[PDB]
């Protein structure tokens, strides 16, 4: 099958966001249409990183209602089931839980209640009593089973290694060197390395976030060869074209 291209749609300016016309619904719809033309299969709406549930809904719901009708899957970054359920009622397809359901266990029964997909990202404060790869697998496998208990199929339970979260630069290199072990879980893996600090370490020289798109595409091609089923990137066009060629060559084997 095809490697899914998840485009990043930030409603607020961050350090990896490039050109800034943010928090405009008409501009977001124009950007979503541009991402679809560049080859994006999924639109990932940025979310909270201690506001209330009503405040978090006020952040995402204007953009969600305007883009949910398009021919592209909508993914919302939220880890609280009250926010996810209101988004799922509007027709969003994916809930990107950056806590893998550890913050709100009701997330699993809510996502299954709407026959949707969920992304489980490895996160934490950086502390662990075991090596990072074994601790990441142990955490994600347990949370992936919780969604499985709730009734979500395995092909709809996405696993994100969480590059840039709860890991040192050396620990991220250990995870990126052993992506086959996470793909071996038979859950679809979502690689998220776009313009993060790990891609800056791939450069021998200091760089800006935009200057890291080519090495981000390198992680995409490297990830697809390792068996990942989707990538979360800023540059949709560069990765989608590169993913299309790698998908052709990998299935050719």
Author numbering: 2 to 50, 57 to 260
The study reports:
Sulfonamides exert their antimicrobial action in two ways, by directly competing with the substrate pABA and through the formation of pterin-sulfa dead-end metabolic products. In this study, we focus on the structural and mechanistic basis of sulfonamide resistance in S. aureus DHPS (SaDHPS), and analyze how recurring resistance mutations can selectively disfavor the binding of sulfonamides while retaining the necessary fitness of the enzyme. Like all DHPS structures, loops 1 and 2 are disordered in the absence of substrates but become ordered in the near-transition state to create the pABA-binding pocket and to structurally and chemically optimize the substrates for catalysis.
However, in our two F17L/E208K structures, F17L and loop1 adopt a conformation that is similar but not identical to the known conformation of loop1 in the near transition state (compare the position of Phe17 in Figure 5A with the positions of Leu17 in Figures 5B,C). Arg176 and Arg204 also interact via a π-stacking interaction to stabilize this 4-residue cluster. When the E208K mutation is introduced, Arg176 relocates to form a salt bridge with Glu179 and Arg204 is displaced. The kinetics, sulfonamide susceptibility, crystal structures and modeling all present a consistent picture of how these two mutations work in concert to efficiently produce high levels of resistance.
